[PDB]
Amino acid sequence: RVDQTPQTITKETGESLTINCVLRDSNCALSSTYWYRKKSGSTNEESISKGGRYVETVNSGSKSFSLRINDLTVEDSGTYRCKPESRDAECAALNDQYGGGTVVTVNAA
Fold first, then answer.
1. Where along the chain do its domains lie?
2. Using an 8 Å Cβ cutoff, are 79 and 7 in contact?
C-alpha cells in the first residue's frame, strides 16, 4: 500500500508545497518512483519530469519519497499521485499500486 499525504493542499502563487509517499505493507524494495498529475478539470494524467522546480527526495530505507514543488503557479492546480516500482509475484504487483492522491489548489497571487 502507498500512503500519500496530505489529501489536500492550498497555497499562494510563489510558495512551495511538499507531498509525501510511503510504501508500506510490502516486502518490496523502493527501486524506482514516478509522479503524475491531472490538471484541474482535465482528463489527461501527465507524467511529472523530475528536476528544476520539482524536487524529489527519496529515503530507500524507509521506502519514503516526497515531491517538493517550488515557485507554485495557478497552473500547478490539480490532482497529484505517486507510484513506486520494484524490481517476486508481489513486486510485479507493486507496479500497480498508487498513492491515494493530493488535490492541490494554487491561488492567483
1. 1-109
2. no
Which grid cell sits at 96? 500497480
Resolution in A: 1.9
Query: Taking a C-beta distance cutoff of 8 angstroms, is the pair 52, 6 a contact?
Result: no
Q: Round to whole Å and give the CA distance between 94 and 9.
A: 26
Contact 4, 81 (CB under 8 A): yes
Strands 2-5 and 17-23, by their bridges, are antiparallel
CA atoms within 13 A on the CB side of 17: 23
Helical residues (DSSP H) of the chain, grouped into ranges: 89-92
CA distance 14 to 46: 22
Paired residues of 19 in beta bridges? 67
How does strand 32-39 pair with strand 45-47? antiparallel
- DSSP character string of 57-71: EEETTTTEEEEEE-S
Q: What class, spelled out in words, does domain 1-109 have in CATH?
A: mainly beta
Cell for 103?
Answer: 488535490
